[PDB]
Design a protein around this ligand. Structure first.
Ligand SMILES: Nc1nc2c(c(=O)[nH]1)N[C@H]1C(S)=C(S)[C@@H](COP(=O)(O)OP(=O)(O)OC[C@H]3O[C@@H](n4cnc5c(=O)[nH]c(N)nc54)[C@H](O)[C@@H]3O)O[C@H]1N2
Ligand SMILES: Nc1nc2c(c(=O)[nH]1)N[C@H]1C(S)=C(S)[C@@H](COP(=O)(O)OP(=O)(O)OC[C@H]3O[C@@H](n4cnc5c(=O)[nH]c(N)nc54)[C@H](O)[C@@H]3O)O[C@H]1N2
Ligand SMILES: Nc1nc2c(c(=O)[nH]1)N[C@H]1C(S)=C(S)[C@@H](COP(=O)(O)OP(=O)(O)OC[C@H]3O[C@@H](n4cnc5c(=O)[nH]c(N)nc54)[C@H](O)[C@@H]3O)O[C@H]1N2
Ligand SMILES: Nc1nc2c(c(=O)[nH]1)N[C@H]1C(S)=C(S)[C@@H](COP(=O)(O)OP(=O)(O)OC[C@H]3O[C@@H](n4cnc5c(=O)[nH]c(N)nc54)[C@H](O)[C@@H]3O)O[C@H]1N2
Ligand code: F3S
Ligand code: F3S
Ligand code: FES
Ligand SMILES: [Mo+4]
Ligand SMILES: [Mo]
Ligand code: NA
Ligand code: NA
Ligand SMILES: [O]
Lengths: 824, 135, 824
């Protein structure tokens, strides 16, 4: 309650390790837990922080606020203070906390806090009202429907959209549990991923070219001469990688270390290049830190990345700023790529809009040999501006070509890497189908009997989201109406009622989640899940560093770890089949005899590539068995970078810093493969929107807001600052539409209609906008198209629309700052 | 015992009419290790004090990791050089963008019409680097 | 926050008056408000309570818990402690607080408290998602549709269900504002009331007989020889009337006062008679207080009240235990009622199931002359057991006949009164139609373009609620689907799209509320309202005692008093008609030039019966103008009993204690009129359910839960105690169905299906049950029938159904008490 003090952890308070729940960087934290009616003393040796609160602390001594504290009430009814604070000795973050990780304590479950509306028990929409139901009933209904569908339609009738990521709502236990359930037991191919509408990858091209997307260390960002940030706003989206590794390089604090590693190499002041249509907070901050002369913002025309990289590739080849020995010994296809990808600087400039002098300068900084003879160490970092860009596959083809020719993989201070989104934590059986299926289109077209959203919310985050919602709400309603007729039915009769409604266009919808979410508008069944700290969980960050987040409290009510929900489902289905005398079907549901999450770790990550093991695709590789919970605990928040190379009791886990340092790539022949990258303009579907409507509807992240705001929607500070999704608009465009900060606009096109509050931004180009994605009040995705690349990767950043004033929200004008988020 | 509130001192800052529009005054509260600013904004804001209800005051220590922020007269914000947090002086220290999880703490001023005095009497929010606002 | 101390109010803390938000009794409270960083001292003269917290306080010295405190954040951003505690000097409650009123502090709006989800701005379901919208846009859409409906269909196309009550979400300002808008301006007859599906009264019969239902003082309960509680559970439903007035009588603490007023009258120990099929906590507490010998529980068969009162009336007439001079001078119809209502004790006993000896005893206690010659003073209190009983009109006819013949109106210590539900606060224009309309049936049948629920939630509280919801959700869906096709439409075009969808079966739904509620499942538009303390509000309690609740804090966001929402709509409609050049229609919307709620009090209550006033029906009567806010403030929480008789500066408001004490009734001739009361058994609709199914599905209140739990659903203590609606069941019946406390059952019949958690209760009769009504998790009303009496009053207590085990909720077993709520 009181805003002007905090309770210090006692010197002997319990302390556990926790990786941040949220973004890829995976900053390390400590959780202090102690009884509510104890506290630490201000003297440094009388509190667990070892800090002297008897007088003012200096800058950088601590990160501690009330938002980093809480009081939990456990299953035994006893109350405990918690404090969740960053670990000063963690190599990832060196004691830094983002505004998002900083709120972890506040977003732990408590009966009266921000977590108050956590799912605590199964919820059933019994035709015309939400009620609680038992887990046994829920499993009878859910497994009963799956069983009926398997028995009559086979697996093709059972649909999922499921996380494949790490951190909270993911990780190695959870991805294995769900993957084993969906792929080995049920054996359904009707599965999409949390952020993309098929069972596919963000990185098909780079992987096929032999370069897995997480190939370096965070230390490489400290060793680089030049950093490219491509389709990426890292201060906001990978905060502490940018703050703890990128900025020290720009500031000159890593120059010593470069020169120590490389005695005979010049290291100029580091420089940074951003390829982004939009001038972001990251551009502004880079210029404040390094100066204007060390930052190059290539403010390309939306969707022109391929043309940019083809023009750069062409130029470095014509200048001879490539590594010919490297290409000759370790690559295939270079000569072909030179021809297919040829594009002059003048043509490049005309397509991208970037002037020729700036294209040449980027190449000069990045690829022209240093005075000491070596090529610059240029780390090429990319994210969703090109992963959700104009033809995912082709852009990566174009970029990786430039990288391979310039030998910017496998050398320290280089890498062509994803910056990442969530943390990573994938261990799954192979996908069981032989084709890519656009799951959302299939649902819209009326296929499937049961759909489970598991740790995602595509109502807010699908492409073409309005078409999806329309269809799902309708299909859901058919089931609701069918259930309505029933009175006094057994569970088995209800299963039959619902099954029949699905033959008539219906769809049974389950959500497995922390919260009701907007999915509750269509769901029939919701199951409560547990997040890290309420469970043990393993995951890795953007340099493959695996850590254990330790359990320290109980979940709300009967919430359960997702891997144990998957075991519960499997065991229900098994029992049903055993009882029906179907031994062969029963046996498909074996191998879920799990009592704790660690069981799922042992069954999945730790079996990969082992004798007698089934086929398992794991980020841990075949040395995953060397990792145990205990060994991770002893490693601390530093963990180990995967893959593990050895272990013994005296040296602990020893891992891998950088990939591809010996020139052996993940292809048949061990070489890196160049690929053609044709420039075909924008897709027709997108070009049609652009031809009809005025504004480029760019979209993405805000620093303060995490994802679909599942926690933030309950946070009064978050809600005061961002009550509605906002749209950055050019002020001249604003005046033309007679809107200002805190007005509400409709944004629309052929695909849909949504709303935002207007946020005038001087740095936005005329005819361009930027709307917060994924949010709880004004869903941006309504106006994204259905267009996807060859692998069903959406162009989420590729849509145009018109904007119409709704009116002036005086309350937003009184409460919300519309001041500039670009620091100068 | 019996006491749930902190024992804040009452410190005179200045008289309101000495303050010029958008020209910050520096002072310490609630002790000499806690730097603060008062500023007359020039137009009324919620909870502003003085004759034009436009005077506001803050702890200038960033609530992220405690560097002293600087007041920017062009934007009426406090900017942190540490990790680029920026706070809105016209929105009770609302974080515009940054890495803090707390708004910039407001120093509560009494304005006495009788004397024209502005007195610091408390703090809304927790000042960086402290177990309690009053050490 | 910390659960082991509280912040005392400073000696100089601001103090305002507040009447409890909730039940009829209208207990008085004080609100202490002071800056967050101040506090009082423990010495009694250093805190505003004047209590000595330097050592343990004795019993009865205070009612103070953390739930009675809060910290509000005002529109200026400043934080203030509040403390809301009962007024020791208020006559109503003498410093008592029920568990419901006691939580008021916790249920005041704060950004992080139990009121966190309060509506703060207009919410729009823009076809496929919830968003914020402006007040201006909301009015343009809502008034635009009303205008279009008026223009094309007339008023018959605009529907409302609106509060008519007092206290929070009602009161004299609010009932006038809404009634003026609906009846004088829009002039729609398509209006029902929050608790009943037509524009009618709960008390047609008693009113028509000349006896308004609130005819005594709370002091009368202190002066009575015998109190009847008919269809009434007062410890739970009118707690502090029962505790502060009834019990002192039963305990002998009022004997002196009776004897002082009536020197030559015997006053035996007081006794109490309950007519209730169910053995309630009220019955158990009465027996603990007074002993078994002074309590009579007439445990009648469901629906048999008419037969009971006809048997009693017959008997007291045959015995001569009536007041013949009274009948002769002041009544009409007696001789006819003796003939029409004749029923022997034996027949009475057969129908009611009460033994003859108990029927005789009730009559002996209540009506046989005392030794000193006077008839007992017998106060007849009744509530929803008979208002929602088997033929509301006939039961009241039967009861009032007994009361009139025995002269139990108009004498001190008597009265035939409603116990009440909400507080009262009615000032309205006359209803504009000439017929009663069953609104829910009309909606189900597809009538109406626009329906507004205004401070009610019939999703949870309609009779035949499942039929209602089915229909409204479907009709709502038609409108959502139509809106879906729009892109870039003006408000006027969207009005047209929606109007067209309503010609195709659709219905536009608005909710004007504190919270989203279940209505959010169907609503297209929700508007934020303000409750007492965020506004000034006037209302009266069950003895007509009017008080002012004083504003002391701001509402959330742009939430507004309901009367000012009504002015806003009226002024929007006026502007639209003015703009369309329709002067005559514009003028219908005059008279809403209101800036504050007090404007509505002046325009309504205080104009009633005044020269050049329109026709106004007001519980204040024609001396209402003598009441002002300032005069009520000076009265304090003691207020004045209405009607006011005089006012001057030296004596303040002086009012009316008891009605009918001169024997002049509210009929044409001034006499009380007897009425025939035929016994016709149960209604056929209800008898058919009884014939088909096993359990009487009785329903009603729980002491701890307020109404539809709109606040309590957010209160962690409340949700832990009552996570799901419960159903009291006989233990033998439980064993037959293999259920015990914490199991979940389905309850169903031909009207619908719902769920409850099983609560074994030894006192429940075999074949009977009792389910909590109105709740957020398991709506009881699904299984109530559509049957209503001649005035469209539902038999909500008249339904039968079957019960089926769903399963054991282990979590409920671990966390919910299933121990007895009947104190012994
Ligand atoms: N227009 C547009 N759309 C986009 C994007 C874009 O750039 N533009 N970005 C895309 C990208 S990169 C992504 S990652 C997606 C995100 O789309 P989603 O995955 O749909 O969104 P999240 O908010 O990550 O969803 C996480 C959900 O899981 C729940 N949850 C949290 N922890 C747990 C847990 O332990 N267990 C379970 N079972 N549930 C849990 C949360 O309550 C929440 O509902 O959006 C995509 N959509
Ligand atoms: N604060 C915060 N951080 C998060 C998340 C969050 O919700 N909140 N979510 C996490 C997740 S799951 C993910 S996927 C990552 C995403 O992290 P990023 O991909 O860094 O973030 P976005 O904001 O989606 O998009 C990055 C940039 O792409 C640019 N852009 C748009 N179209 C184009 C184009 O055609 N080409 C190019 N080159 N650039 C383009 C946009 O202007 C934008 O600045 O962030 C993660 N980190
Ligand atoms: N089966 C069964 N059904 C019954 C009964 C029963 O005995 N049996 N009882 C009936 C009776 S007596 C009644 S009173 C009804 C109750 O039926 P309703 O009136 O539907 O129920 P309430 O909970 O009183 O509704 C109050 C609503 O107004 C909102 N609210 C509160 N304060 C305000 C305010 O200031 N302004 C506005 N605009 N909204 C506000 C609340 O959030 C809530 O949604 O139920 C009836 N239904
Ligand atoms: N705790 C609390 N108190 C409240 C409220 C609340 O929600 N919570 N709501 C308020 C409102 S709006 C109202 S209307 C009142 C209602 O207050 P009451 O009417 O006292 O309460 P109910 O529980 O609805 O029903 C009263 C009794 O009717 C009995 N009964 C049922 N059927 C019959 C029948 O055929 N004949 C007779 N003689 N008795 C029968 C039941 O067994 C029950 O004990 O309570 C008010 N007070
Ligand atoms: S604190 Fe969390 S949100 Fe990312 S920058 Fe660090 S892992
Ligand atoms: S405290 Fe409130 S709920 Fe009734 S008994 Fe008194 S008015
Ligand atoms: S210390 Fe101010 S932003 Fe980090
Ligand atoms: Mo992502
Ligand atoms: Mo009621
Ligand atoms: Na939409
Ligand atoms: Na139902
Ligand atoms: O009521």
């Amino acid at each position: 309650a009181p805003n002007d003090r905090i309770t210090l952890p006692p010197a002997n308070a319990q302390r556990t390790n926790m990786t941040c729940h949220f973004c890829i960087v995976g900053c390390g934290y400590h959780v202090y837990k102690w009884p509510e009616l104890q506290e630490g003393g201000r003297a440094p040796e009388q509190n667990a922080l070892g800090l002297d609160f008897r007088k003012q602390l200096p800058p950088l001594a601590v990160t501690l606020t009330p938002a980093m504290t809480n009081v939990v009430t456990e299953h035994d009814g006893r109350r405990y203070d918690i404090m969740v604070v960053p670990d000063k000795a963690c190599v990832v973050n060196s004691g830094l906390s983002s505004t998002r990780g900083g709120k972890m304590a506040s977003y732990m479950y408590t009966p009266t806090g921000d977590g108050k509306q956590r799912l605590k028990a199964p919820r059933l929409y019994a035709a015309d009202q939400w009620v609680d139901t038992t887990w046994d009933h829920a499993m009878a209904l859910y497994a009963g429907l799956i069983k009926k569908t398997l028995d009559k339609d086979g697996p093709q009738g059972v649909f999922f959209s499921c996380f494949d990521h790490g951190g909270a709502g993911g990780g190695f236990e959870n991805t294995w549990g769900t993957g084993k359930l969906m792929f080995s037991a049920i054996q359904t191919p009707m599965v999409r991923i949390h952020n993309r509408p098929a069972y596919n990858s963000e990185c098909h091209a780079t992987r096929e070219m032999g370069i897995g997307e997480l190939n370096n260390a965070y230390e490489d960002a400290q060793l680089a001469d030049v950093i490219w940030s491509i389709g990426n706003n890292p201060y906001e989206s990978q905060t502490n990688y940018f703050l703890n590794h990128w900025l020290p390089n720009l500031q000159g604090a890593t120059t010593s270390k470069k020169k120590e590693r490389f005695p005979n190499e010049n290291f100029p002041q580091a420089r940074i290049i951003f390829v982004d249509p939009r001038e972001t907070p990251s551009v502004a901050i880079a210029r404040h830190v390094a100066g204007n002369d060390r930052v190059l913002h290539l403010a390309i025309e939306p969707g022109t990345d391929t043309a940019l990289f083809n023009g750069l590739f062409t130029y470095v080849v014509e200048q001879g700023w490539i590594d010919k020995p490297f290409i000759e010994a370790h690559t295939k296809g270079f000569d072909d790529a030179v021809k297919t990808n040829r594009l002059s600087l003048d043509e490049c400039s005309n397509i991208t809009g970037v002037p020729v002098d700036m294209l040449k300068r980027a190449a000069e900084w990045s690829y022209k040999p240093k005075a000491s003879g070596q090529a610059p160490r240029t780390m090429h970092a990319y994210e969703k501006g090109i992963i959700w860009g104009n033809d995912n596959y082709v852009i990566q083809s174009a970029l990786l070509d430039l990288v391979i020719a310039t030998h910017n993989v496998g050398r320290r201070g280089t890498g062509c890497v994803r910056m990442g989104g969530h943390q990573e934590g994938y261990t799954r059986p192979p996908y069981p189908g032989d084709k890519k299926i656009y799951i959302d289109q299939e649902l819209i077209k009326g296929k499937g009997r049961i759909m489970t959203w598991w740790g995602c919310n595509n109502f807010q985050t699908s492409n073409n989201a309005q078409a999806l919602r329309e269809a799902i709400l309708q299909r859901s309603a058919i089931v609701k109406q069918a259930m309505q007729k029933a009175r006094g039915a057994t569970t088995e009769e209800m299963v039959d009622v619902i099954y029949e409604a699905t033959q008539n266009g219906g769809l049974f919808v389950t959500s497995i989640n922390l919260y009701p979410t907007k999915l509750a508008e269509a769901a029939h069944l919701m199951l409560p899940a547990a997040h890290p700290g309420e469970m043990n969980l393993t995951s890795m960050n953007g340099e493959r560093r695996i850590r254990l987040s330790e359990k320290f409290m109980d979940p709300p009510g009967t919430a359960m770890a997702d891997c144990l929900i998957a075991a519960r489902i499997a065991n229900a289905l098994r029992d049903m089949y055993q009882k029906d005398g179907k031994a062969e079907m029963a046996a498909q549901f074996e191998g879920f005899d799990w009592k704790t999450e660690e069981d799922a770790f042992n069954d999945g990550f730790r079996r990969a590539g082992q004798p007698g093991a089934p086929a398992i695709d794991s980020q841990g590789g075949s040395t995953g068995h060397l990792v145990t919970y205990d060994r991770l605990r002893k490693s601390g928040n530093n963990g180990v970078q995967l893959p593990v190379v050895s272990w013994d009791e005296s040296k602990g886990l020893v891992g891998t810093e950088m990939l591809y340092t010996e020139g052996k790539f993940d292809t048949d022949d061990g070489k890196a493969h160049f690929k053609p990258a044709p420039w075909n303009g924008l897709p027709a579907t997108v070009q049609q929107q652009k031809d009809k409507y005025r504004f480029w509807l760019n979209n993405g992240r805000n620093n303060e807001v995490w994802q679909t705001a599942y926690h933030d929607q309950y946070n009064s500070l978050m809600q005061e600052r961002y009550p509605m999704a906002y749209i950055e608009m050019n002020p001249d465009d604003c005046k033309q539409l007679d809107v200002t900060g805190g007005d509400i606009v409709e944004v629309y096109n052929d695909f849909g209609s949504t709303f935002a509050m207007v946020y005038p931004v001087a740095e936005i180009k005329r005819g361009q906008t930027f709307m917060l994605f994924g949010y709880v009040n004004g869903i941006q995705g309504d106006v994204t198209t259905d267009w996807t690349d060859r692998n069903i990767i959406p162009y989420y950043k590729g849509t145009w629309g018109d904007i119409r004033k709704v009116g002036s929200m005086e309350e937003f004008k009184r409460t919300v700052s519309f001041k500039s988020r670009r620091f100068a | 015992a019996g006491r749930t509130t902190l024992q804040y001192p009452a410190t005179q800052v200045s008289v309101a009419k000495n303050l010029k529009a958008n020209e910050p005054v520096s002072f310490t509260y609630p002790d000499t290790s806690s730097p603060c600013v008062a500023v007359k904004l020039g137009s009324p804001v919620p909870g502003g004090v003085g004759p034009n209800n436009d005077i506001v005051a803050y702890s200038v220590l960033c609530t992220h990791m405690g560097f002293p922020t600087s007041y920017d007269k062009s934007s009426k914000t406090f900017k942190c050089p540490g990790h680029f947090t920026e706070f809105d002086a016209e929105k009770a220290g609302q974080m515009i963008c940054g890495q803090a999880t707390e708004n910039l703490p407001r120093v509560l001023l009494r304005y006495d019409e009788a004397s024209d005095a502005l007195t610091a009497v408390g703090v809304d929010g927790l000042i960086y680097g402290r177990q309690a606002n009053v050490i």
